[PDB]
Each structure stands twice: as structure tokens, then as C-alpha cells.
Amino acid sequence: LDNGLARTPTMGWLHWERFMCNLDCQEEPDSCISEKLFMEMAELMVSEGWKDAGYEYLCIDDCWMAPQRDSEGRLQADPQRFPHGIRQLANYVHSKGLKLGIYADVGNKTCAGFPGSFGYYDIDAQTFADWGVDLLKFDGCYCDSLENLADGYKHMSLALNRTGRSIVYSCSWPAYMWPFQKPNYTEIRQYCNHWRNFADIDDSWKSIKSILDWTSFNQERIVDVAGPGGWNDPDMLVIGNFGLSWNQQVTQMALWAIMAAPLFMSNDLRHISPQAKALLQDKDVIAINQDPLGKQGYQLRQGDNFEVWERPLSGLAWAVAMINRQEIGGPRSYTIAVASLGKGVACNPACFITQLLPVKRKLGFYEWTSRLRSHINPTGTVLLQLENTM
Amino acid sequence: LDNGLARTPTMGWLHWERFMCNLDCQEEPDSCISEKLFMEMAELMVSEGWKDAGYEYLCIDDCWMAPQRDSEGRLQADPQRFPHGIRQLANYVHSKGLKLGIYADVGNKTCAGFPGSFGYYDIDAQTFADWGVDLLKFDGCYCDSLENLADGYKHMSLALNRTGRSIVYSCSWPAYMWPFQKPNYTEIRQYCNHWRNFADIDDSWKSIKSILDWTSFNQERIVDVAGPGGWNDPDMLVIGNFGLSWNQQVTQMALWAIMAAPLFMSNDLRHISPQAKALLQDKDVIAINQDPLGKQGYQLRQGDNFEVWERPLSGLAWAVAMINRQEIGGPRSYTIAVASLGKGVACNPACFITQLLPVKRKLGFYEWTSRLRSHINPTGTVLLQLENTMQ
Ligand SMILES: *[C@@H]1O[C@H](CO)[C@@H](O[C@@H]2O[C@H](CO)[C@@H](O[C@@H]3O[C@H](CO)[C@@H](O)[C@H](O[C@H]4O[C@H](CO)[C@@H](O)[C@H](O)[C@@H]4O)[C@@H]3O)[C@H](O)[C@H]2NC(C)=O)[C@H](O[C@@H]2O[C@@H](C)[C@@H](O)[C@@H](O)[C@@H]2O)[C@H]1NC(C)=O
Ligand SMILES: *[C@@H]1O[C@H](CO)[C@@H](O[C@@H]2O[C@H](CO)[C@@H](O[C@@H]3O[C@H](CO)[C@@H](O)[C@H](O[C@H]4O[C@H](CO)[C@@H](O)[C@H](O)[C@@H]4O)[C@@H]3O)[C@H](O)[C@H]2NC(C)=O)[C@H](O)[C@H]1NC(C)=O
Ligand SMILES: *[C@@H]1O[C@H](CO)[C@@H](O[C@@H]2O[C@H](CO)[C@@H](O[C@@H]3O[C@H](CO)[C@@H](O)[C@H](O[C@H]4O[C@H](CO)[C@@H](O)[C@H](O)[C@@H]4O)[C@@H]3O)[C@H](O)[C@H]2NC(C)=O)[C@H](O)[C@H]1NC(C)=O
Ligand SMILES: *[C@@H]1O[C@H](CO)[C@@H](O[C@@H]2O[C@H](CO)[C@@H](O[C@@H]3O[C@H](CO)[C@@H](O)[C@H](O)[C@@H]3O)[C@H](O)[C@H]2NC(C)=O)[C@H](O)[C@H]1NC(C)=O
Ligand SMILES: CC(=O)N[C@@H]1[C@@H](O)[C@@H](O)[C@@H](CO)O[C@@H]1O
Ligand SMILES: CC(=O)N[C@@H]1[C@@H](O)[C@@H](O)[C@@H](CO)O[C@@H]1O
Ligand SMILES: *[C@@H]1O[C@H](CO)[C@@H](O)[C@H](O)[C@H]1NC(C)=O
Ligand SMILES: *[C@@H]1O[C@H](CO)[C@@H](O)[C@H](O)[C@H]1NC(C)=O
């Protein structure tokens, strides 16, 4: 989408995976979906270095709305949970140097069953712009046909444009299409800054494997379409929650960098481990994700329960991820000829290799004919950066 | 098996899950299956408090053997990886106050393809006894029929008995019957100290869930036969490795205590986190597992992605485990009437409830009519010990 936004993948925080649709502020006031939750997250995004690392979008997912529209046909923030309204939340967020994201749905209801934007695209778009919203995640539930789905996504894109406000537009468009038809990513890119392709992530290694496997299986359809202003979205970072081993967390961070994915944390910034914080704020890995060239990486090869992925970077640099998918035993050795990397030009005539994950370490120079040996933990990943010597 | 052994579930270390069948001592001398690996683990079992916690059997799994039997028809330790032989290793382990376990197979080959014991049961039993072996894990691979399988397990039991040496006998018998024939656990218990029922564990939450779900699905068949000298084996503890989150590790430790499972660690004692070490050495949780009464726990209820398991303990006490199987969101509230716990007698007239996992904390007295409220992390478990107020 040619709105000057998302020239690198969008970085932020999104409540959904960790906090979901919790409406019970009686019993669980510190975890229910309320203005206080987002105000606290915004405070910690500044104070705990998240904004400095590059995470600038604080995003409300589903279950922020009142059950009904007001008498002027506008979406309302829940009166009990957002008593001061979204404008005041937006102003608070902007005062921290952050940006506010919000959620709506192309169909008649949100996926959680709250008011949809069908019949109200212009009104909702203007409401959001008038509130000071900076990002819109636009979901695809309760839409009665794929033609209405596509039309609505295009209408909302133009409606947001007409407001004149800079609003990052996130479309779940192709995710609801894939089961029935192959999406037209050329069309989707014209209207969207990024797009969810596949099923919702959850707090598990299984979920992460399915997203990677779906992405690598379908990489010829989706990789080349991605670029500055338009990204594939494999869903939220779930690092720092409950269901992932340390190695599986390193794997998600590494592969989301390789995939040029938007980096939307979904965790509790109030209660997050030092190690999870360090991984998510890793400047060298974020630098790969944020690389200005914006070429999405891909799976180079798979076999013997290993995978090798790579991503071309600006300045003739390459990022290389090697994943160990064998979930038994100990660290397993993997040897690759560097000549196989970067279409043969990464290390022609030579390259300097630095390991970034699981620990940062310089590995020295490598001639075009040389081989790289690494030991990779089960479900873990080794992430390398290659610098050409020319 | 009525041999005076395994009166509580056997506790120890078993190399298989973490080290497997690594024969490459050229490239990986510190992780290949060798006498050096086991000597290092035995040293650490003493020096890092494992033996004090109860872990006493240092067990060799598959891939210790040379490819051929000797001229007298005996199994041999691999000469390059165990150049000093099994006897000296057994002696070394015995000098630490530890016990040595070893692996063999009822069929023609071990699962990794090395010499099996079919046609050599007496010879192998005699060989192990002579070496000073204290435990035999006896596998069921490469057996042409279930009749031969059962006969071989019975023969080796009797062969071990005739040596006169006390040897804990671990039988994979029923795991190779399932789901083809219905195991008879009264028969199996007569010949074995414990028995693998289900597929090999690996370093994954999927595996742990698979083992728990299999067990709860089959609990009516297997729970009652368990007891002193005869245990169900749901396979190794894989805590301290690579594939489990903290909460999933807590879940394994809690449920293996509930299940009265043998506690065979498979990990690298040279490289294990203080957190993992503390969990595996948790005195209160080990005390539940090792309860003298030896009554295996069971799944009391499941619904809404929650599971409640309970185990009757000695001294009118009960262990209760609550698992959150929803793998999305945050800690989830769960409430249960304490009158539902321990078949209604645990908290009649009252009980004192102490949380043991994920952290230890006294919860206080609960009357028979009261309700217990807990918050449980995704893929995590809350483990409680109930103490009745009669004594
Ligand atoms: C799973 O395996 C176990 C152990 O083998 C079985 O339990 C055994 O069942 C047999 C019956 O087949 C019992 O034998 C009997 O023992 C009593 C002693 O109390 C004898 O009086 C009795 O003798 C009669 O029958 C014999 C037939 O050959 C003759 O020699 C005699 O002349 C006389 O007529 C017979 O020997 C075992 O005592 C019993 N062992 C144990 C440890 O309990 C399981 O059998 C089932 O469960 C048992 C508890 C019992 O209820 C059986 O009736 C059940 O069939 C077996 N389970 C299955 C599903 O087959
Ligand atoms: C609503 O939609 C319209 C129609 O697409 C959209 O107008 C477009 O805006 C973009 C971004 O501002 C314009 O592209 C720019 O063109 C100027 C002049 O040629 C260039 O200076 C810009 O290049 C710089 O910035 C780029 C990043 O955007 C960098 O890639 C580059 O290196 C430079 O630093 C940039 O190419 C585009 O010209 C118009 N298109 C049309 C048809 O007018 C408008 O922005 C949308 N409005 C809202 C509210 O979203
Ligand atoms: C080979 O097989 C034979 C036949 O099974 C086996 O003989 C059995 O050995 C066990 C264990 O030593 C004997 O069990 C003991 O029996 C006596 C009474 O006769 C009891 O005093 C013993 O009590 C101990 O264990 C109790 C557990 O309930 C404790 O409460 C108590 O504190 C004691 O520690 C114990 O029950 C059993 O009598 C014999 N059986 C027969 C028929 O002879 C032998 O051990 C096997 N040999 C090897 C080397 O495996
Ligand atoms: C949101 O819900 C509204 C209301 O139900 C949907 O509008 C309705 O859509 C149906 C079918 O999509 C329309 O039916 C059509 O009627 C014409 C005759 O006029 C007929 O030729 C067609 O074959 C079809 O049966 C219906 O007219 C329309 N009703 C209203 C009140 O507008 C809307 O499509 C839903 N939006 C999404 C995105 O799902
Ligand atoms: C693909 C997609 O957008 N999925 C979304 C998920 O991300 C979340 O927003 C949820 C809210 O109810 O609705 C969906 O299923
Ligand atoms: C059920 C059973 O005994 N499983 C065993 C496993 O625990 C290990 O010993 C392996 C060695 O090759 O062989 C088997 O599959
Ligand atoms: C995809 O969409 C673009 C823009 O609408 C169009 O030019 C192109 O033909 C479409 N591709 C196909 C084959 O559907
Ligand atoms: C082992 O092999 C022999 C010869 O092939 C066969 O007759 C015998 O039944 C086998 N034993 C088992 C336990 O499978």
C-alpha cells in the first residue's frame, strides 16, 4: 500500500494472544481488556526500552467495543472498561511517543461477536482518524461472500485514505480466502500495509511449526510480493509467555526476522523474564527484521530434520537460519557449504560470518569453497549474518 | 515381582532420551555412549545431591554392546567405548553408593540393531549378575510373535532369579502388546518390577500430553495393578533438556509423582539449569512419588481444557494436580469443591492444603463444604497436598 507507511515491518504490541477477550474486570481487573491495561503497557513500552528497540505501535485487538453503536451509528468503546474513551487513550499513547492501533471487522460482527463495520466503512474510518488512531487491524469474520470480503477490504482502504490521516492498514484478507481461493497478492498489496496469511498463533511450539511449514510450503506464492509498504504477517510474537522453551523462543525470533514479518509482541510487559526481554530487544536480530532492502527470506532447503532459511539484506549481506526439528537427543551438528548460501554470491570470493543466536559470536572469514559447521539444539535455531568481502 | 525390590518407584538416570545411540567418539567424545559418560554422571549423581534426593540407579540403555558375542556366547561391552568393561564400571558405580542398570532385548536384536538375548537368556542373566548389574531394562524389539515375547520376558525373569543377585527387572512387554493384545498385568507384575506401557517419550510437550492422555484414557485398566514391587512406567523425565517450557516441566514432574512412576531422568547432569535441578530434587514432590503406600493416582475430572488428577497417600493425605490444557491466553481460574477431592474423605471434616508446585505455599484449612480456587498457567500444573484433620 503506497501510503508511505510500513517501509519496514511494523513493530508493536498487540493484546490478543496473551489477554484475549477477557471482559471480567470484577474478578480480574489487572488482566481484563480495559483502558488501564493499555495505559500500563504504554508506560512500560517507554520505561523498559521497548520503544527504543523499535516497538512503537500499541494495538488494541478485539473486544474493546460496546455491544451496540451509538445513536449516530458510531462504534463505541465499552463504557465500563474504557470509560474515558479511545480519544483520551490515543492522546495518552501519543504523549509517550507511541502510536495507537485498533481493531475492526469487514463483516457484520467481529470474530468475538461485537459490531462489524459492514455498512459503516466511511463512518468507522472517520471515527478512527478523528480519534487519532494510527493503525487498523481489519478482520474478516462474519462476511457472507469472498466478493463482499474483498470489496469491503478495498472500500475500507480507500475510506482510511480519504481521512487524510496516516493509518497503517493490516488486512486479514488472504487468511479468509486461502481455504476457498488463491489470493491475488498484487491486489492485496495495492490496498494493505500487511496481511495475515494463516491461522491464529497460540502459545505453543506446534503452532509455530505449522506457521513455518505453511509459509515454506507456500513460499513461491508469497515471498516475492513482500517489500517496503506491504508485508506478509505470520502473526504475533508469543515470546515471554508460557508454552515455549527457550530454544523455541529463539526459533520464533530468528525466523520472524528472516521472514520480514511485522513484530507484534503479545505478552505481559509487566511480567516478562529478563531473558525473554533480551531476545525481543536484540538489536542485531531486529536489524535483520528491519533491513531497509525489505526482501523477505525463504527456506533454502530441508532434510534430515534440519531446515536452512536465508534472507538477502542490503549491502550484499545475508541472514541465515538453521533450525533443528528433531525433538529428541541433544545438540545436533549441521554442516553446510557456504557456496550454497546466497545463490552462490554471499561468500564469493569470501564472507565474514557472525552468529547472532542463540549467542552472539564472531566466526571469522569463510572462502567460497569453505564449509560451516554448527551445533543446533532440538527445536532451536542458529542465526548467522554473512558479510561479503568485496 | 516378589523380589523385595522397587518397594517404591525406582529412581535414577537413563541415558537414552538425551544421548541416544551416539557411537561417534571421534567427533563427539563428550556425548558418545562410553564408559566415560557414565563415570562422569555417577560422580555428579553424588556431588550434585541427586543420590541424596533418591536417584540411585545409573542406567545404561541401548548401544553399549559390541556388534558380536564372544566365543563363549556372551554379550561384550564395545571394546573402544567401554575398554575397561562393564565389571569395572559396575565396581566404580558401586564405590559411589550407586547401582548400575543395563539394557538388553528379548528378541534377536536390540532396537538400535545390536545383539539381542533370544537364545541366550540364561547366559545373559548369568553375565549381568557376574558383572554386578543391579537393574535390567529388557526391551521387546525384533520379536517375531507376542507368544515368544511373553515367554522371553518370563524366561529372563526366572533366569535373573536363579542368579541369586537382586536385580530390578524393567519390562517393555506390555508396550509391544498394545494395541494388538490386552496385557494381563497380574501376569506381568508376577515377573516384572515395572513395565513400559506406551510409546517412547521425546523432548516435547506433545509427547508429554500424549503419555498423559494415553494413561488417563487407559487408567481403569492399569492404575489398580500398580503398587510396591510393580509399577507402570510412562517413560523418562525429560526435564532440564530443550523442548519444554518451565510450566511443561512442572507438569511432567507433578504428574509423574501422581502416577507413581519410576523417575528415570534423561538429561545432561554436567549441564543442567539450577531451576531444573531444584524441580527434579524437590523433596516434597519426590515424597509424593515415593509414598510407601504405592497407590497410583488417576484422572478425577476433565472439562473446559482443565484436568484434575489425584493420588491417595499414606497418613490419610492426598496429592491433587490441576492441569491447564488451554495453550492460549494467560493464567486461568479454576474452582473445585473440596468434597469432590479424595473420594469425599480427604477434607471431611476438614483438610489443610499446601501448594507444592509451581511454588510451595500453605493455603490453610478447608472445611468439607468449602471450595478451592486456583490460577493455573497455560500448559502448567498446580500440585497440592491435602492433609486431613483427624490425625
Ligand atoms: C490374568 O492372569 C492372572 C494370573 O495368571 C489370572 O489369575 C489367575 O487365574 C487362575 C484361573 O485361570 C487362578 O487359578 C486358580 O487358582 C485357585 C487357587 O485359589 C485354584 O483353586 C484353581 O484351581 C481350579 O482350576 C484349575 C484349572 O486348571 C485346576 O487346576 C483345579 O483342579 C481347580 O479346578 C485355579 O488354579 C489363579 O489363582 C489366578 N491368579 C491370581 C494371581 O489371581 C487372571 O484370571 C482372572 O482373574 C483372577 C483374579 C480370577 O478372577 C480368574 O478367574 C480370572 O479369570 C488372568 N485374567 C484374565 C482376563 O484371563
Ligand atoms: C492515499 O492514497 C494516495 C494514492 O496512493 C497516496 O498518495 C501517494 O503517497 C505516496 C507516499 O507519500 C507518494 O509516494 C511518494 O512520492 C514522492 C514524490 O515522488 C516521493 O518523494 C516519495 O519518496 C520518498 O519516500 C518514499 C517512501 O514513501 C521512499 O521510498 C523514497 O526513498 C523517498 O524517501 C514517495 O515515493 C505517492 O506519490 C502518492 N501517490 C499518488 C498517486 O499521488 C496518499 O499518500 C494516501 N494518503 C493517505 C492519507 O494514506
Ligand atoms: C526369586 O524368587 C523367589 C520367589 O518369589 C523370591 O523369594 C521371595 O523373596 C521375597 C523377598 O525377599 C520374600 O518376601 C519376604 O517374605 C518374608 C516372609 O516369608 C517377609 O518377612 C518379608 O518382609 C519384607 O518385605 C515386606 C514387604 O511387604 C516388608 O513389610 C517387611 O518390612 C520386610 O522388609 C518379605 O515379604 C518372599 O517370601 C520370597 N518368596 C518365596 C515364595 O520364597 C526371591 O527373592 C527371588 N530371588 C531373587 C534374587 O530375585
Ligand atoms: C451483513 O448482513 C446483511 C443483512 O443480512 C447482508 O445484506 C443482505 O445480503 C443478502 C445476501 O448477501 C442479500 O440478499 C440478496 O437479495 C437479492 C434481492 O434483493 C437477491 O437477488 C440476492 O440473490 C440475495 O438473496 C440482501 O439483500 C441483503 N440485505 C440487506 C438488508 O442489505 C450483508 O450482505 C452482510 N454483509 C456481509 C459482509 O456479510
Ligand atoms: C486472521 C485473523 O485476523 N485472526 C484474528 C485474531 O488475530 C484475533 O484478532 C481474533 C479477535 O477476535 O479474531 C481472529 O480470529
Ligand atoms: C518401549 C521401550 O522399551 N522403548 C525403547 C526405548 O526406551 C529405548 O530403550 C530404545 C533403545 O534403542 O529402544 C526402545 O524403543
Ligand atoms: C491480480 O490483480 C491485479 C490488479 O487488480 C490484476 O492486474 C491481475 O491481473 C490479477 N491477477 C490475476 C491473474 O488474477
Ligand atoms: C529370531 O530369529 C530366529 C531365526 O530367524 C527365529 O526363528 C526366532 O523365532 C526369532 N526370535 C524371536 C524372539 O523373534
| Cβ–Cβ < 8 Å for A22, A32 | yes
Instruction: Give which of B131, B80, B141, B135 is closest to B102, Cα–Cα.
Output: B135
Name the residue with cell 488428577. Answer: B309
* Helix, coil or strand: residue A105: strand
Amino acid letter at A28?
A: E
Report how far residue A341's alpha carbon sits from residue A311's, in angstroms, rounded to the nearest whole number: 10
Task: List, in sequence order, every residue forming a beta bridge with A318; answer none if it has no partner.
Answer: A312, A386
Instruction: Tell me the CA–centroid distance for residue B142 and ligand 8, in Å.
Output: 8
User: Where are the extended beta strands (E) located within chain A?
Assistant: 11-14, 57-59, 99-105, 135-139, 168-171, 194-196, 231-233, 263-265, 298-303, 306-312, 317-324, 332-337, 350-357, 361-367, 371-376, 381-388
> Of how many residues is chain A composed?
390
| Cβ–Cβ < 8 Å for A288, A322 | no
Report how far residue B211's alpha carbon sits from residue B227's, in angstroms, rounded to the nearest whole number: 20
Angle at B91 between CA B102 and CA B24, to 5 degrees: 50
Of ligand 6's atoms, which has the minimum distance to the CA of residue B196? 1
- Beta carbons of A204 and B330 less than 8 Å apart: no
Report how far residue A49's alpha carbon sits from residue A59's, in angstroms, rounded to the nearest whole number: 17
**Domains of chain B, first to last:** 1-293 (3.20.20.70), 294-391 (2.60.40.1180)
Q: Which residues of chain B are within 8 Å of residue A268 when distances are taken between CB atoms? A: 330
Amino acid letter at A169?
A: Y
Task: List, in sequence order, every residue forming a beta bridge with A237; answer none if it has no partner.
Answer: A265
A267 to chain B, minimum CA–CA distance in Å? 9
| Cβ–Cβ < 8 Å for A313, A289 | no
Task: List, in sequence order, every residue forming a beta bridge with A104; answer none if it has no partner.
Answer: A138
Report how far residue B307's alpha carbon sits from residue B303's, in angstroms, rounded to the nearest whole number: 7
Distances (CA, A) of A261 to A134, A295, A320, B70, B110: 19, 11, 16, 60, 47
Chain-centre distance for alpha carbon B147 = 26
Count of CA atoms in the C-beta half-sphere (13 A) of A64: 25
Report how far residue A184's alpha carbon sits from residue A24's, in angstroms, rounded to the nearest whole number: 41
Amino acid letter at A42?
A: A
Instruction: Give which of A184, A203, A201 is closest to A192, Cα–Cα.
Output: A184
> Of how many residues is chain B composed?
391
* Helix, coil or strand: residue A317: strand
Radius of gyration, alpha carbons of chain A: 21
Experimental determination technique? X-ray
* Helix, coil or strand: residue B18: helix
Nearest to A328 among B202, B333, B378 (CB): B202
Which ligand lies nearest to the CA atom of residue B294 in the structure? 3
Catalytic residue among B122, B130, B151, B200: B200
Report how far residue A380's alpha carbon sits from residue A250's, in angstroms, rounded to the nearest whole number: 7
Distances (CA, A) of A218 to A178, A213, A224: 11, 8, 11
Instruction: Tell me the CA–centroid distance for residue B4 and ligand 3, in Å.
Output: 5
Report how far residue A310's alpha carbon sits from residue A321's, in angstroms, rounded to the nearest whole number: 6
* Helix, coil or strand: residue A163: helix
Catalytic residue among B61, B78, B105, B139: B139
- Characterise A164 by phi-psi region: left (phi > 0), alpha (psi -120 to 50), beta (else): left
Residue in B closest to A15 by C-alpha: B329
Residue in B closest to A31 by C-alpha: B330
B27 to chain A, minimum CA–CA distance in Å? 10
Count of CA atoms in the C-beta half-sphere (13 A) of B354: 10
The helix, strand and coil proportions of chain A, stated in percent and rounded to the nearest 5, come to: 30, 25, 45
- B298 grid coordinates: 488417576
- The helix (run of H) or strand (run of E) holding residue B192 is none
Q: Which of B102, B171, B172, B197 for mutating ligand 6's site (highest number of atoms within 8 Å of CB)?
A: B172
| Cβ–Cβ < 8 Å for B62, B51 | no
Report how far residue B244's alpha carbon sits from residue A156's, in angstroms, rounded to the nearest whole number: 43
| Cβ–Cβ < 8 Å for B241, B10 | no
- B303 grid coordinates: 472439562
Instruction: Give which of A320, A322, A329, A321 is closest to A378, Cα–Cα.
Output: A329
Report how far residue B10's alpha carbon sits from residue B228's, in angstroms, rounded to the nearest whole number: 10
Amino acid letter at A211?
A: I
Chain-centre distance for alpha carbon B95 = 24
A380 to chain B, minimum CA–CA distance in Å? 8
| Cβ–Cβ < 8 Å for A184, A163 | no
Report how far residue A121's alpha carbon sits from residue B348's, in angstroms, rounded to the nearest whole number: 61
Q: What is the dihedral of CA A12, A16, A18, A23, to 10 degrees?
A: 130
Report how far residue B360's alpha carbon sits from residue B349's, in angstroms, rounded to the nearest whole number: 24
Say how many C-beta atoms besides its own lie within 10 A of residue B273's C-beta. 14
- Beta carbons of B241 and A20 less than 8 Å apart: no
| Cβ–Cβ < 8 Å for A196, A177 | no
Instruction: Give which of B100, B106, B218, B108 is closest to B151, Cα–Cα.
Output: B106
The helix, strand and coil proportions of chain B, stated in percent and rounded to the nearest 5, come to: 30, 25, 45
Report how far residue A292's alpha carbon sits from residue A322's, in angstroms, rounded to the nearest whole number: 23
- 8-state DSSP, A147: H
Residue in A closest to B32 by C-alpha: A330
Q: Active-site residues of A: which are they?
A: 139, 200
Nearest to B18 among A22, A243, A330 (CB): A330
Amino acid letter at B287?
A: A
Of ligand 5's atoms, which has the minimum distance to the CA of residue A63? 12
Instruction: Number of A to B CB contacts under 8 A, please give it.
Output: 92
**Backbone dihedral angles phi then psi of residue A116, each to the nearest 5 degrees:** -80, 170
| Cβ–Cβ < 8 Å for A284, A247 | no
| Residue with CA nearest ligand 7 atom 2 | A187
Say how many C-beta atoms besides its own lie within 10 A of residue A137's C-beta. 24
Of ligand 3's atoms, which has the minimum distance to the CA of residue B229? 27
- B255 grid coordinates: 504428574
Bridging pattern class, strands B99-105 and A381-388? unpaired
Q: Is A363 exposed, middle or buried (0-12, 13-18, 19+ CB in 10 A)?
A: middle
Name the residue with cell 493490516. Answer: A170
Report how far residue A188's alpha carbon sits from residue A195's, in angstroms, rounded to the nearest whole number: 8
Q: What is the resolution of this structure in A?
A: 2.0
User: Where are the extended beta strands (E) located within chain B?
Assistant: 11-14, 57-59, 99-105, 135-139, 168-171, 194-196, 231-233, 263-265, 298-303, 306-312, 317-324, 332-337, 350-357, 361-367, 371-376, 381-388
Report how far residue B74's alpha carbon sits from residue B68's, in angstroms, rounded to the nearest whole number: 9
Say how many C-beta atoms besides its own lie within 10 A of residue A359's C-beta. 8
Instruction: Give which of A357, A134, A326 is closest to A255, Cα–Cα.
Output: A357
Amino acid letter at A96?
A: K
Report how far residue A362's alpha carbon sits from residue A385's, in angstroms, rounded to the nearest whole number: 10
Report how far residue A63's alpha carbon sits from residue A67's, in angstroms, rounded to the nearest whole number: 9
Largest CA distance in chain A: 72
Instruction: Give which of A325, A328, A335 is closest to B27, Cα–Cα.
Output: A335
Name the residue with cell 554470491. Answer: A345
Say how many C-beta atoms besides its own lie within 10 A of residue B3's C-beta. 15
Say how many C-beta atoms besides its own lie within 10 A of residue A181's C-beta. 10
